[PDB]
Symmetry: C3
Subunit: 343 residues, 3 copies
Amino acid sequence: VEKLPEDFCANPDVAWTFPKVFYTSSQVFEHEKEAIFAKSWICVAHGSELAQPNDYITRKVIGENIVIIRGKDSVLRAFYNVCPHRGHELLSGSGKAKNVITCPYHAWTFKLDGSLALARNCDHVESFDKENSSMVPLKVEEYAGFVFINMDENATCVEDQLPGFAERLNQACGVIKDLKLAARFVTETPANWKVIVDNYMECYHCGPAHKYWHTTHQNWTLQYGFAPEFHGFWTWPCTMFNVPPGSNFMTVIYEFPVDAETTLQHYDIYFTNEELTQDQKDLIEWYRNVFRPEDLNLVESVQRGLKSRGYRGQGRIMTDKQRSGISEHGIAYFQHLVAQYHQ
Amino acid sequence: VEKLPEDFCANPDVAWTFPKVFYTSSQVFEHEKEAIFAKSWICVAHGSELAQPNDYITRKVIGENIVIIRGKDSVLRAFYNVCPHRGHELLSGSGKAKNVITCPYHAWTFKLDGSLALARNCDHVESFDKENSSMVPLKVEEYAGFVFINMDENATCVEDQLPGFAERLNQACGVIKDLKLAARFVTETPANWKVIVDNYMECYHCGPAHKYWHTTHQNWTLQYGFAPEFHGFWTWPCTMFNVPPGSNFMTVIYEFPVDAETTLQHYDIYFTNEELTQDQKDLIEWYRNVFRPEDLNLVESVQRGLKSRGYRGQGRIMTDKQRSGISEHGIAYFQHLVAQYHQ
Amino acid sequence: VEKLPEDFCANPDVAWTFPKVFYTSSQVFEHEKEAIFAKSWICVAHGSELAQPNDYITRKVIGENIVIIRGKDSVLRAFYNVCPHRGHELLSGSGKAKNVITCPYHAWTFKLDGSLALARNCDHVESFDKENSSMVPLKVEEYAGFVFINMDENATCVEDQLPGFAERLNQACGVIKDLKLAARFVTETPANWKVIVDNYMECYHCGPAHKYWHTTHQNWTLQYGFAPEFHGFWTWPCTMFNVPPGSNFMTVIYEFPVDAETTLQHYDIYFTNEELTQDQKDLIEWYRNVFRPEDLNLVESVQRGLKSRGYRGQGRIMTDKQRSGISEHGIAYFQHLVAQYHQ
Ligand code: FES
Ligand code: FES
Ligand code: FES
């Protein structure tokens, strides 16, 4: 019951952010949960976490607990982390699964491809089938050295969602296959997922709050320049890849929305060294205690302020004709794509 | 707006649990709160707690704070624990009331039968009546050595709800009158009340999670066998009585539902000894640290899992034709009775 | 969809409190939030906090974060505490602002009259105006030595809301201009704002819970007598001023409702001495540890009790014909005024 014009933010030069209801309303969220996050490829991890047989990880997004597991046969698969019998969760955290997944409730065992191996007493229950009593899968794809899932089984590949992205990311960082997760920050954030994307898409505050060109592509954008290149990739719907100068490491921001005003964030820092140099250990500390706190306070305060009847519905996107670094035109592009799911 | 067929689970051999909405929906809960828990006899305590004049207890169920009190005249009564003047609560916890109940707000005093004794300045207020300014009662019955309340004042007795139960319980345990509460575990549990009953009604997991026959009766069931007999009584709507081998003590599980995904549980352990033997003190510790944690984790994980779009609506009730101990047919009987309130 | 007769409580001699829904319902609250608190003068502070240039305070009411600030030019102003750019909050707590208000996000600066002074890069954004990019004001008035705001910009003055109040308050306390805030108690209270007003409007319990005449006026009442006079002012919608015997100090109760069952309360204690006498420091301790706890427990227990189906809808307002100190007739007057917004 809450819609937007199609030309919304099509012209970045004269554009305003969403009406406030799109940042706060439970009905806008449930629509986006089904129309966007249930039908789009969602990035969940770098490939290093899932590189070896029996390696698995677990993730929560839009209230779906997901397990991604590298099979004994080295095939990467993803399932809903819920037992098909009576609904117990199957696995927790991350690590190396064993050769079978045993449900902690009634001890049904599944192969690592989801196949029900043994369900106790099953051959004496009437009208039971081993198949169709399997763990329920969803699509998974390795792309650009990262791992994407999709809850729509008719989905086509990541490349159809992010045309050109993988080729450009490999041109930004040539050692992505060699990266290892050196630190992760988990934060449940009281801000709508679109508020967090807004913050990322702009460099109006890189100096008053923390050689610059922001170019839009098909469902992704890139913030590029020289500082020694630096890259900042935003990709639909909300995963950000940073390649700081030197191009030898990455940080990735994963957004796992929970509800209209809550978002789970993973802030991952990837280096190529197993043992960190002191420069890297110090850099992790600067990210945890300085940089990321400043960013989270910003979106939290903004989430509070925009509910106020004193915030007049929308806010002005500060685009300049020359598209300088402090131009907010990236926001306009993102909100235009979002408007397309609200016609 | 969420209904069920009448033959739902009438045939245990080919049966599935409820659609997931009945375990999660606030509208299913409010309907069950009024149609089931406001019109059924609810077990709240063993008779020992209320055996002496002025003994009282307090209980919370479906958001109703109840007081049960043995009158000075030795008559057992139950009232809503709310002052009829402006709504302050009257009593807290349990113990021995005094000869009058004095409201902590404006100090109206009531006899232990709810009769307003003194309301300050009342004879100068126009159109006031002492009677019809009393504490508001509800039905209470002592049955099977336990205490049952009912919020429907037109209710008939417990026996019409649980035909045969008291006779069978006395055949399971002959010293019920002599039992004393040796320990109580209070836990607010993030699981729908029907999930907790499901867990109790099955012995599919007594070995992989913690001479067996489960027979259904009129609104109650019994899990029976030899291990020296052992008994497990489920009674409508959700109170469970355990009589472990030796038949000399009992544990009782009381379920006081709060909302669609929350249930208050009392786990009571009753012995006949005032001073416990070391075997009993150790047994209380095994129940608190081992047994009950395992049970609560099970239902909590199940409550989370069944919301997942990966849990395909319902789950298969694993009944075998021979009705062995690991047969889940008890669940089918319970869900059939519940379906009867959702036509 | 929840209304009241107009003669509701017009006759204090035969009157009952509201039906329970008006104390609990989110729909009754949202209506009162817009019809009452968005259109009425709301008291927020004593004038001493805002007496000097650049002095400011912040307040939360009905989910609106407000800033009141004495301009460099000594003019008192109030604004919504939200940046007009993208919605960050501007200021926090209380104290002395600087000559400009700099938004912590993108560093737009505002004059202390809300005027946008500098918005970085603004002259290169198309169709931008400095004016109409200002902080959004609301009405503020100094009245009776206290500070009132109003969110309706077409409002007339406080005097039209509280006719006679300021003249009577100055007759109760002659040194209001000289008062200094000696202590504040902040408590988020789980009780509807109308429950807290009910508690204040009565002296049925001044003796069983903690020369007396309660006279009603236009939107305010006064509890008066000798104990050496004492005064107790209630004013619409919910601010209470106490002038204890000796008339040399005041306590003020501010009610900032949050939702149907939550109210933020400030309990302010004002003396004329900058350095407190031991009698005053002890009196602050008696208020914090004894008096106010008793009052907050009362309304919290009442909020719980009135939801119970055992509380029969309404409660009797105990008015006597002679209108003695323990007469509850003040409540009737307040609820009659409230009924006028629920026709
Ligand atoms: S819930 Fe997993 S085996 Fe029963
Ligand atoms: S609320 Fe119990 S006497 Fe007034
Ligand atoms: S939000 Fe205040 S300057 Fe951008």
